């Protein structure tokens, strides 16, 4: 599939948001570098929420189409609904 075109919705889903937040929170809790300036935050959930609001999440979503193909979306490339 050419990267120039994609058929999936440009909006992140609730399930995608939940799993991205959980995975990034686990990564942060396992001593990963942070992409935001932590004012005083010390808990991975709110750190990941701040990273999501900053659109600086180093995670790529592999949206598997039913036909067997997949489209790769960056978190920064998806509109956050909430």
């Amino acid at each position: 599939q050419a990267n120039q075109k994609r058929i999936t919705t440009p909006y992140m889903t609730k399930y995608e948001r939940a799993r991205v937040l959980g995975t990034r929170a686990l990564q942060i809790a396992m001593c990963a570098p942070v992409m935001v300036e932590l004012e005083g935050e010390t808990d991975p959930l709110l750190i990941a929420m701040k990273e999501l609001k900053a659109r600086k999440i180093p995670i790529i979503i592999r949206r598997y189409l039913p036909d067997g193909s997949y489209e790769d979306w960056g978190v920064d490339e998806l509109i956050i609904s909430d």
Partner: protein, 209 residues
């Protein structure tokens, strides 16, 4: 005893003309909506006495695309259709160069005739219809949405777009009443356009298996 029979025959004729028109065949307007008086003046008033005899209600109708492709409409005399009647009809289609026909039985089909219908399908194809299902036009019921046959090009286009196999699609049996009305075959796909209360219009695709 007689008015009932002529009314039944007129209604069957109207239903067959509508079925042929829906199948894409040359059906004239007057023959499409033929009234009781016109039917009487054209065929007769006393089917019991012989006017109209069931043999005279034969219909020759041609396809829109090719007059070289046309089908026969038959109303057999006997109540139960036998292998002899099937054979004489097959001989008639052989001499007249006809590949499609409709058998409008009065009561039912003999098992040998049904087996011959099954086995002889490739060269000559012909279908069997009880008289009772023909007294009403099924496609005009409110529960029956609009069914339209898809050409091979449209089926390929649909499959290409939805990136799915024919299997993935929902199915309609070959013995389904609407499938029998349209005279489709296993492997063809129909397009069902029905009103919806959540979107207005919905199109679903059914593959015959």
């Amino acid at each position: 005893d007689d008015e009932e029979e002529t009314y039944r025959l007129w209604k069957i004729r109207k239903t067959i003309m509508q079925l042929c028109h829906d199948r894409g065949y040359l059906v004239t307007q007057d023959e499409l909506d033929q009234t009781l008086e016109e039917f009487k003046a054209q065929f007769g008033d006393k089917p019991s006495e012989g006017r109209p005899r069931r043999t005279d209600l034969t219909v020759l109708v041609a396809h829109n695309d090719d007059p070289t492709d046309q089908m026969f409409v038959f109303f057999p005399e006997e109540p139960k259709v036998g292998i002899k009647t099937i054979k004489v009809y097959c001989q008639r289609m052989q001499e007249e160069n006809i590949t499609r026909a409709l058998i409008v039985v009065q009561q039912g089909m003999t098992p040998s005739a049904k087996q011959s219908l099954v086995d002889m399908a490739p060269k000559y194809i012909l279908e069997q219809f009880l008289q009772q299902e023909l007294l009403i036009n099924i496609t005009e019921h409110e529960l029956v949405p609009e069914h339209v046959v898809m050409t091979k090009e449209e089926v390929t286009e649909l499959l290409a777009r939805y990136k799915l196999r024919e299997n993935q699609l929902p199915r309609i049996q070959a013995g389904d009443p609407v499938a029998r009305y349209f005279g489709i075959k296993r492997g063809q796909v129909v397009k069902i356009i029905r009103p919806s209360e959540t979107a207005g219009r919905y199109i679903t695709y059914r593959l015959v298996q």
